[PDB]
Design an enzyme around this catalytic site. Sequence first.
Site, PDB file in Angstrom:
ATOM      1  N   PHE A 138       0.828  -1.199   0.000  1.00 13.42           N
ATOM      2  CA  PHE A 138       0.000   0.000   0.000  1.00 13.42           C
ATOM      3  C   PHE A 138       0.872   1.262   0.000  1.00 13.42           C
ATOM      4  CE2 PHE A 138      -3.515   2.577   0.177  1.00 13.42           C
ATOM      5  CZ  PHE A 138      -4.659   2.137   0.841  1.00 13.42           C
ATOM      6  N   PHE A 139       1.943   1.268   0.788  1.00 10.20           N
ATOM      7  CA  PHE A 139       2.875   2.400   0.734  1.00 10.20           C
ATOM      8  C   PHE A 139       3.505   2.539  -0.657  1.00 10.20           C
ATOM      9  CE2 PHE A 139       2.946   4.407   4.765  1.00 10.20           C
ATOM     10  CZ  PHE A 139       2.674   3.449   5.727  1.00 10.20           C
ATOM     11  N   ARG A 176      10.185   7.529   6.039  1.00  8.66           N
ATOM     12  CA  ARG A 176       9.284   8.016   5.004  1.00  8.66           C
ATOM     13  C   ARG A 176       9.069   9.534   5.074  1.00  8.66           C
ATOM     14  NH1 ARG A 176       5.680   5.965   1.283  1.00  8.66           N
ATOM     15  NH2 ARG A 176       3.849   7.329   0.938  1.00  8.66           N
ATOM     16  N   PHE A 193      -7.091   7.232   3.277  1.00  5.36           N
ATOM     17  CA  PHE A 193      -6.353   6.668   4.399  1.00  5.36           C
ATOM     18  C   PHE A 193      -6.773   5.216   4.587  1.00  5.36           C
ATOM     19  CE2 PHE A 193      -5.320   6.047   8.966  1.00  5.36           C
ATOM     20  CZ  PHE A 193      -4.015   6.515   8.970  1.00  5.36           C
TER      21      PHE A 193
HETATM   22  C1  LIG Z   1       0.043   5.858   1.980  1.00  6.18           C
HETATM   23  C2  LIG Z   1       0.003   5.685   3.473  1.00  6.18           C
HETATM   24  N1  LIG Z   1      -1.117   4.856   3.969  1.00  6.18           N
HETATM   25  C3  LIG Z   1      -0.596   3.581   4.492  1.00  6.18           C
HETATM   26  C4  LIG Z   1      -0.333   2.552   3.417  1.00  6.18           C
HETATM   27  C5  LIG Z   1      -2.063   4.519   2.889  1.00  6.18           C
HETATM   28  C6  LIG Z   1      -3.499   4.687   3.318  1.00  6.18           C
HETATM   29  C7  LIG Z   1      -1.776   5.608   5.079  1.00  6.18           C
HETATM   30  C8  LIG Z   1      -0.981   5.684   6.380  1.00  6.18           C
HETATM   31  C9  LIG Z   1       0.045   6.625   6.558  1.00  6.18           C
HETATM   32  C10 LIG Z   1       0.763   6.664   7.746  1.00  6.18           C
HETATM   33  C11 LIG Z   1       0.449   5.807   8.793  1.00  6.18           C
HETATM   34  C12 LIG Z   1      -0.570   4.875   8.626  1.00  6.18           C
HETATM   35  C13 LIG Z   1      -1.283   4.821   7.437  1.00  6.18           C
HETATM   36 MG   LIG Z   2       1.173   9.986   0.160  1.00  6.55          MG
END
Ligand SMILES: CC[N+](CC)(CC)Cc1ccccc1
Ligand SMILES: [Mg+2]
Length: 340
Positions: free
Chosen positions: A80-81, A323, A183
């Site tokens: 997901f990141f 990050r 999110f």
């Molecule tokens: C792109 C980041 N994230 C996580 C994969 C996608 C929804 C949200 C997130 C950022 C930071 C902490 C927790 C979730």
């Molecule tokens: Mg982003």
Amino acid sequence: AVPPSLRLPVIEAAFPRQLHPYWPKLQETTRTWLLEKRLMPADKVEEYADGLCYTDLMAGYYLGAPDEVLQAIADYSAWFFVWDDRHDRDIVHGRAGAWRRLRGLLHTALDSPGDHLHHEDTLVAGFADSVRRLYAFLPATWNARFARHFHTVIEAYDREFHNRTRGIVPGVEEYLELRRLTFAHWIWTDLLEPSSGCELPDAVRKHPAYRRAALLSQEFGAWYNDLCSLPKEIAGDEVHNLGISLITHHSLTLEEAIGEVRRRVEECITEFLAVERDALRFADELADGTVRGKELSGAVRANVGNMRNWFSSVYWFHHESGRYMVDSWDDRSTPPYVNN
Ligand SMILES: CC[N+](CC)(CC)Cc1ccccc1
Ligand SMILES: [Mg+2]
Ligand SMILES: [Mg+2]
Ligand SMILES: [Mg+2]
């Protein structure tokens, strides 16, 4: 030491961190998976993967998850990141076609992941692998709900693509609505269930205390991300951030916006503390003497416990993860860990 503007004494004092005992194996297994699925180049995995703390984040959240469940969640989350990174890069490079095709492939793979395990786009194949494994834990009804939720997430990402290409900053309420999707609030909420080994009936998971506790946990995470990722996002021409919407549509300064976001974050915490009492009372009520009642009670209690764990995991993740360390990059608009 957390920067004063981002520090939340209540989290530090009243939300003690937890760490799943599988974390050490989890860190290396996800790293290997990233490498094997070719989601990041080998030398970037070597230099950056551990420092990104993606596994730490999930291991501080889904406490009590079976190791195999935690592993699938962690791989999915790392994926997901990397997807957020791809989306960003497609926008920055104007790759509208590549994004459209990926968007379509993800919708398809989400419904039939097995068929996509060896797809030509490694990002799609990685998605399919993690999703197939997530679909093996609970009944098909949970799988269908996860898919329904993620189809919505994909489309929110598409809306983001168009906002950023068309130069539009969402209004505050518009943004707050969209942010529950970008999110992935309902995905993390869905994943509480395989973590505690029980698909909850609609009657249980839609109980107003469960719903509200689940919502507040995710609102905190999203808005605290906004607070902490604002510097990286301003540097990279990202427009999706509560702070940016406030500067734009409410005419606040940067300082005023940071303050307003911080206040909304702090309020999430104390709203959660109040509803957490009601959710835990609900967990108690379910334990009516029956086997099923005990199963449901234990699962709701574990899930609400993990909604609480999300606060501390997300909080520390933002101070630990590479990050967000934009001050350390030679080019603040291009994080070193993304494929440019
Ligand atoms: C792109 C980041 N994230 C996580 C994969 C996608 C929804 C949200 C997130 C950022 C930071 C902490 C927790 C979730
Ligand atoms: Mg982003
Ligand atoms: Mg994003
Ligand atoms: Mg962010």
